[PDB]
Amino acid sequence: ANPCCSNPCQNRGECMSTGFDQYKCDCTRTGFYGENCTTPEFLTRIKLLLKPTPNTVHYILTHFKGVWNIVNNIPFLRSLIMKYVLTSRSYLIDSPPTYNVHYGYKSWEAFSNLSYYTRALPPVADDCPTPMGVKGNKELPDSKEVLEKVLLRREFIPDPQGSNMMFAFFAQHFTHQFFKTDHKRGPGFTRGLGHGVDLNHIYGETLDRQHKLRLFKDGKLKYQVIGGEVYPPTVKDTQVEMIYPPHIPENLQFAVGQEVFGLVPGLMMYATIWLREHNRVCDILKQEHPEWGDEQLFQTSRLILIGETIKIVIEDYVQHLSGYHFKLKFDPELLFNQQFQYQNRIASEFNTLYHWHPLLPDTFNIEDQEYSFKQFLYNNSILLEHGLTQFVESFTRQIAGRVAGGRNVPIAVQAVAKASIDQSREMKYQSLNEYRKRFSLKPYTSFEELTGEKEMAAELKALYSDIDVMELYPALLVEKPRPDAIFGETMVELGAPFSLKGLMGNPICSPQYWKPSTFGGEVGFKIINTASIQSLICNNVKGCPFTSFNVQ
Amino acid sequence: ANPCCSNPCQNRGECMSTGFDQYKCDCTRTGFYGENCTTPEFLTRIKLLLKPTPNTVHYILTHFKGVWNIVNNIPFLRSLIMKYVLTSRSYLIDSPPTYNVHYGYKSWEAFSNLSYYTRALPPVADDCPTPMGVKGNKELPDSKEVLEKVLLRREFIPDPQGSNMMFAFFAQHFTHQFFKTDHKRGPGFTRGLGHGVDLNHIYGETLDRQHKLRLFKDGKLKYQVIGGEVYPPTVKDTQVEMIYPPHIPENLQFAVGQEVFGLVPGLMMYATIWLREHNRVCDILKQEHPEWGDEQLFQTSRLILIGETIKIVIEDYVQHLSGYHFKLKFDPELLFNQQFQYQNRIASEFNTLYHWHPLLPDTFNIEDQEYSFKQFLYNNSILLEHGLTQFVESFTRQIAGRVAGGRNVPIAVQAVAKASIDQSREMKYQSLNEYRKRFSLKPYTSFEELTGEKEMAAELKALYSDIDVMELYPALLVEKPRPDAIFGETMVELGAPFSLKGLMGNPICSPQYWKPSTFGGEVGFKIINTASIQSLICNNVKGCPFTSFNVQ
Numbered sequence A, B: 001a002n003p004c005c006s007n008p009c010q011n012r013g014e015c016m017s018t019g020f021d022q023y024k025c026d027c028t029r030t031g032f033y034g035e036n037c038t039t040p041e042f043l044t045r046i047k048l049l050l051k052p053t054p055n056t057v058h059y060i061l062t063h064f065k066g067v068w069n070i071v072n073n074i075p076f077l078r079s080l081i082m083k084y085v086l087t088s089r090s091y092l093i094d095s096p097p098t099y100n101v102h103y104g105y106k107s108w109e110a111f112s113n114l115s116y117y118t119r120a121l122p123p124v125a126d127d128c129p130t131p132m133g134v135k136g137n138k139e140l141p142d143s144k145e146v147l148e149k150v151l152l153r154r155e156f157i158p159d160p161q162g163s164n165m166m167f168a169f170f171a172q173h174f175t176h177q178f179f180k181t182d183h184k185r186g187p188g189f190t191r192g193l194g195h196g197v198d199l200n201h202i203y204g205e206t207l208d209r210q211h212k213l214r215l216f217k218d219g220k221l222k223y224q225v226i227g228g229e230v231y232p233p234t235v236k237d238t239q240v241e242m243i244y245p246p247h248i249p250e251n252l253q254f255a256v257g258q259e260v261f262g263l264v265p266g267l268m269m270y271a272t273i274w275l276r277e278h279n280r281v282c283d284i285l286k287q288e289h290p291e292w293g294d295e296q297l298f299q300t301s302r303l304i305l306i307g308e309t310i311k312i313v314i315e316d317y318v319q320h321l322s323g324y325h326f327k328l329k330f331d332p333e334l335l336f337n338q339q340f341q342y343q344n345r346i347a348s349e350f351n352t353l354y355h356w357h358p359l360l361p362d363t364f365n366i367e368d369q370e371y372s373f374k375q376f377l378y379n380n381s382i383l384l385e386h387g388l389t390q391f392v393e394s395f396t397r398q399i400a401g402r403v404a405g406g407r408n409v410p411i412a413v414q415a416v417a418k419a420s421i422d423q424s425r426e427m428k429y430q431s432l433n434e435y436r437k438r439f440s441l442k443p444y445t446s447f448e449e450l451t452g453e454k455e456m457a458a459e460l461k462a463l464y465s466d467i468d469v470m471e472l473y474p475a476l477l478v479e480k481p482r483p484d485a486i487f488g489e490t491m492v493e494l495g496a497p498f499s500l501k502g503l504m505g506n507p508i509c510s511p512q513y514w515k516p517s518t519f520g521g522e523v524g525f526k527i528i529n530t531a532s533i534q535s536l537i538c539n540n541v542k543g544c545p546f547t548s549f550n551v552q
């Protein structure tokens, strides 16, 4: 019914109805004009002729290693390239944000209501004849069939980039501070009102929760000591609400900032490490500032840990997953003379693409044990049994699964994968190809081009008929990986700009925050600027075990 | 005891304690170095030894009328200057915001908690030996004595700039969407969580209040007709909470977005006008878009009225109060190639400086009647009796009071003036001279220099002893005005950057919003770009009476 149902406006032109059966494309600042914003301005043809494709740039970043070594060791040159990386990657995201699950046009409600995830692409209107707009059949193919045919794991496929369980659980722990769906309201709603890296998964989303978690001495968070080792306090001792099945002993219900972190020992491992890190930073600050009170010690340490998180995420975590030989750098100063908005709104599509469940193994191997999913979930006794040191050593050694490439979702979480499909449809996501165009990628012209093989493509052809009807979420998991890579093109090109905004958009990266006094002086500042996944583990885990995001 | 109590760091350097009796200044990016950030770097020496003073700039903007006349009539030149004006006025506000009433250092709590007003200068620490830090006596002078000696009106002092009651009530109506102190929590807290121009004073702060005010047909707001004229609906009809004394009959309990707007018929006049404007724009959009539903008509109209409001605030309202011969321009495009943060957090000091109660007359003169304060307050029957047309005609003719220059607060609101003093102290405001330095102004060296006269200066000298201990709020009302102006230097130099951020920081001014389709096409867009206080009144008040912000 809506004349904009067919998504006729190209190159980010905006579609507006002008009657029951007519539309107008607003081509303002797109660089194109004409009825559908497809005629390039002269400068546009110049830009287009020059810009390399994402696969070309990926090739360059993953080759000429000898050259990247030269670059990485020349400070001013590394800075220069990172500066370019930053600006190149930061023009695709609407900031201030625009659409959401209930608004396919800009509105004050969509802007102002922080309970929604934002949307990179507006939803397919409710009165459109087909789920994707006007293409395809009345209903999309059975989600169970999609799941069973091309997503479910047959044999475990290891990640060729060598990602390990330290990587998988770091991804889970880190992202679950800003992916926190409010199931009461619906899949298009979030409980993470900070919309980014605020460390609410350590400190609590609300002030009441934070205060229940705090010791109110020396800036510290409450903790218990068990067999000489520091662990989170209990629900019983703190009244911090946590999600635990009823059969869990009171003494095993650890209470942390994020209420779902009792779900798996690997989340609780990271919760425990960051808890120790907070109190460690508290000791350092108290040493540097014997005149400070508890409140300032707490707040300053939180700012420092936010800093360390952003640092580690960029220079270790994103560094590893990218596969780049270029050494990414966390340096807010690089944006100070550039246009950039210090703010972020978490996109629904970012949440959706980040469902990296293929990472998980069939069993979790710690020391000489192999835990099934059933044994592993909600089982903090496993953490106490083995200890943090053994957990790190074991997770560092265990390979994670490949995410793109298809057929690698562990069956234990098949309901989760089905729900990602079903809820994408519920939220009226536009198709894979629309999202590809939205991120300046070439539309796939066949299912074989998407997968790079023939068997899964054939299954999908039979299911969807038209590549233009293929959905974003399953596509991300069946996409042809880059050579020996964990992800395909669509995953990287969508994930990167969302991730950048969540990290650099933090206020601590703004010029008035990014200075020593914000972090209690040069000592606190140095903690941020020297942070690494290895140092986080070395400072807080007995014996300073070697760790890394890849298997050795 | 805090070693930062004396405010040792200059030129926006940040003070941090480094022990019980030592501090350190963080001079990062100040352009100065040395223990207190007072040694100018070389390039700072250049900038300084040729930056014109605010009074010089104000001289130039308010003279050479013939030159400005040429400038105003050459579009590219007017734009060029406005572009300069915009950037020259946007480097003084911390954005993302920093301090608040409870935090004299940056913290995640101060950044994230939207219920606080933010602070342009951090509060004086609790354990400082004196209210202002280290200077002055153990107690500030009796606020009643300060009020009675230099603030309270003897004889009515008319504004020489000719500001009228349309101006005064516009100031009150417009600002009360973002100055909404949460008295439950304290003077440092706000109920205006949008922190700017969101028009919650028409539409309501919350969705459920908004939905009570809406007709749910054609995008319109509920209204009632009395004697052939459109007025806001009642509390009985809508169920929205309003503040009214218990003796107001049900038929006079008007319901509007801001709960206090029944306080005064002047506010209800503007509430009525803006309600009519919303419904007018709904009519226009429905004509443009027969295919649109109620929700989109409502949301689009709200966006349009937001643009109208910003347009009128800049080009009529601020235009009048500034006294500039240069014609200010609302043009979001002028910021598109500039560094600028599209966000805003309302500053407590902005709230404080905007207590412009000396504007108020001794009596409110409508048609042939002169109403007293007791007669005027909470008396909407006056509005019904005379009507909007007579309100506009009368308020356009009636002169408002001068704000700077002292002794012009009407006795009827003396408790409000005393509270501004008392709450400033509660919120631990730094001194007038610290605020002047914060905004690049020369500190006053005596009370006579502050007032430009001798009698009020002498009383203040007796009360305060030291000019460096003089408080911000009463200083603003006793300050020497610019020549035949309504305000003095401090008022304009603090007010201007805060005001700019609230208006241009609005998301509708960002590039992704500032396009015709956001407002339902060129028709909606034209309504914003041609808006004016005269056309607002012309379109919505019977007879289209002439109006202006100047008695003229």
Ligand code: HEM
Residues within 6 Å of the ligand: A168, A169, A171, A172, A175, A179, A180, A181, A183, A263, A264, A351, A354, A355, A356, A357, A359, A360, A377, A413, A416
């Ligand atoms: C043993 C490990 C894991 C289990 C048992 C698990 C299970 C689940 C379940 C049941 C949900 C749905 C939760 C809900 O709807 O409230 C979910 C959501 C999610 N998972 Fe996993 N998952 C695991 C690991 C991971 C990993 C390694 C990642 C890496 C990125 C990940 C990413 C996500 C994301 C981003 C969501 C959506 C969060 C939200 O919107 O609230 N998960 N997972």
Ligand code: HEM
Residues within 6 Å of the ligand: B168, B169, B171, B172, B175, B179, B180, B181, B264, B351, B354, B355, B356, B357, B359, B360, B377, B413, B415, B416, B419, B420
């Ligand atoms: C008949 C006219 C007016 C009356 C009866 C009035 C009265 C009041 C009162 C009772 C308060 C609350 C004080 C407190 O809680 O301590 C207040 C606050 C305020 N007034 Fe007025 N006023 C009037 C006109 C104006 C005008 C013309 C302006 C011009 C801008 C203005 C600006 C303000 C501001 C900015 C506040 C602080 C509001 C807040 O933070 O919520 N008022 N006024």
Ligand SMILES: *[C@@H]1O[C@H](CO)[C@@H](O[C@@H]2O[C@H](CO)[C@@H](O)[C@H](O)[C@H]2NC(C)=O)[C@H](O)[C@H]1NC(C)=O
Residues within 6 Å of the ligand: A206, A207, A208, B113, B114, B115, B116, B184, B185, B186
């Ligand atoms: C914003 O900060 C205020 C000030 O601390 C918070 O209000 C306090 O909240 C606690 C409950 O968490 C109450 O016991 C206090 O009475 C409140 N104090 C005041 C002065 O109101 C408020 O909760 C914070 N808001 C958010 C969203 O965290």
Ligand SMILES: *[C@@H]1O[C@H](CO)[C@@H](O[C@@H]2O[C@H](CO)[C@@H](O)[C@H](O)[C@H]2NC(C)=O)[C@H](O)[C@H]1NC(C)=O
Residues within 6 Å of the ligand: A113, A114, A115, A116, A184, A185, A186, B206, B207, B208, B209, B211
């Ligand atoms: C943000 O939007 C959601 C969705 O509209 C709002 O949730 C609705 O609020 C009304 C109250 O006016 C309830 O009657 C509905 O049940 C809510 N719907 C859902 C899905 O929860 C929410 O109130 C909005 N938040 C704000 C701050 O306005």
Ligand SMILES: Cc1cc(NC(=O)C2=C(O)c3ccccc3S(=O)(=O)N2C)no1
Residues within 6 Å of the ligand: A085, A086, A089, A314, A318, A321, A322, A328, A487, A491, A492, A495, A496, A497, A499, A500, A503
């Ligand atoms: C997949 C995937 C990729 C990804 N992120 C990135 O590719 C990606 C980042 O996350 C990012 C973070 C900080 C500064 C710059 C970059 S980047 O240039 O946009 N790039 C390396 N997150 O998930």
Ligand SMILES: Cc1cc(NC(=O)C2=C(O)c3ccccc3S(=O)(=O)N2C)no1
Residues within 6 Å of the ligand: B085, B086, B089, B314, B318, B321, B322, B328, B487, B491, B492, B495, B496, B497, B499, B500, B503, B504
């Ligand atoms: C007093 C007072 C002044 C004032 N504002 C101004 O002086 C002032 C504005 O408010 C402003 C509004 C939009 C764009 C640019 C300007 S300005 O250059 O900062 N200037 C004229 N608000 O209260």
Ligand SMILES: CCCCCCCCO[C@@H]1O[C@H](CO)[C@@H](O)[C@H](O)[C@H]1O
Residues within 6 Å of the ligand: B053, B055, B056, B059, B060
């Ligand atoms: C060659 C001069 C170019 C124009 C400069 C005009 C400056 C006059 O400006 C003066 O500034 C003083 C500063 O305190 C104020 O006291 C005066 O009121 C003001 O007139």
Ligand SMILES: CCCCCCCCO[C@@H]1O[C@H](CO)[C@@H](O)[C@H](O)[C@H]1O
Residues within 6 Å of the ligand: B148, B149, B152, B153, B154, B411, B455, B456, B459
């Ligand atoms: C409403 C004003 C209150 C007047 C009575 C108490 C004020 C006492 O204050 C005095 O008032 C005189 C008034 O012009 C001034 O000459 C004095 O300088 C001032 O001290």
Ligand SMILES: *[C@@H]1O[C@H](CO)[C@@H](O)[C@H](O)[C@H]1NC(C)=O
Residues within 6 Å of the ligand: A006, A008, A034, A035, A036, A038
């Ligand atoms: C614009 O797009 C529509 C698709 O809805 C197409 O039918 C029309 O011919 C296009 N016009 C062009 C490309 O000039």
Ligand SMILES: *[C@@H]1O[C@H](CO)[C@@H](O)[C@H](O)[C@H]1NC(C)=O
Residues within 6 Å of the ligand: A374, A375, A376, A379, A381, A382, A383, A385
């Ligand atoms: C939890 O882990 C422990 C090992 O610490 C194991 O003995 C136990 O069986 C597990 N619980 C469940 C329900 O599998």
Ligand SMILES: *[C@@H]1O[C@H](CO)[C@@H](O)[C@H](O)[C@H]1NC(C)=O
Residues within 6 Å of the ligand: B006, B008, B034, B035, B036, B038
């Ligand atoms: C720095 O400031 C303090 C002011 O309290 C003063 O004691 C010291 O002499 C100053 N040093 C300078 C201005 O070089």
Ligand SMILES: *[C@@H]1O[C@H](CO)[C@@H](O)[C@H](O)[C@H]1NC(C)=O
Residues within 6 Å of the ligand: B374, B375, B376, B379, B381, B382, B383, B385
């Ligand atoms: C209310 O306004 C009317 C004029 O409409 C006036 O005559 C009356 O005195 C006012 N009421 C009070 C209590 O002042």
